[PDB]
Amino acid sequence: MALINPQFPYAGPVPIPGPAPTETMPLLNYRVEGRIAGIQQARQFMPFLQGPHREVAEQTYYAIGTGIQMGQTFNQPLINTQEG
Amino acid sequence: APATIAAGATGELTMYYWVPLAYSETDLTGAVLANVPQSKQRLKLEFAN
Numbered sequence: 001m002a003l004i005n006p007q008f009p010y011a012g013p014v015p016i017p018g019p020a021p022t023e024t025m026p027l028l029n030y031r032v033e034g035r036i037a038g039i040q041q042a043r044q045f046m047p048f049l050q051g052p053h054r055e056v057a058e059q060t061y062y063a064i065g066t067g068i069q070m071g072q073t074f075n076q077p078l079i080n081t082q083e084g
Numbered sequence: 085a086p087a088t089i090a091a092g093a094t095g096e097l098t099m100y101y102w103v104p105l106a107y108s109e110t111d112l113t114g115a116v117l118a119n120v121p122q123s124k125q126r127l128k129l130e131f132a133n
Contacts, residue, residue, distance in 0.1 A: 038120025 103127070 078084070086095040106115035118125065 036117060038117070038123035040117075041119050041121055044119065 085097045085099075089095040104114070107113045116125070
């Protein structure tokens with residue numbers, strides 16, 4: 001967006017020496033076929049386990065029984081003959 | 085390395101080299117799959133004399 005100087009104008013570009021025209025043109029680089037080499041193993045001996053863990057520990061229980069329940073020799077009360 | 089080993093003295097040297105395969109620790113360009121049991125790798129090292 002330059003302003004044209006009317007007192008000192010200039011013309012378009014003139015030819016100048018050039019950079020040997022084939023040396024600015026590249027070759028198209030020619031890929032050969034390739035292979036991810038080797039026979040891959042199916043599994044890996046991992047350093048960490050792959051499953052979930054638990055944040056807190058919960059107390060577990062198992063039921064037990066008591067035993068054969070016996071009789072008893074109670075201390076027996078007195079007879080309510082109007083004193084009680 | 086000691087800067088000067090005198091006449092009759094002994095100097096101890098230590099050097100570390102990083103031989104790169106991947107470009108960086110976040111760019112894996114150049115890394116090698118090595119999960120192949122029958123295909124070995126090889127790291128040839130010539131040392132001084």
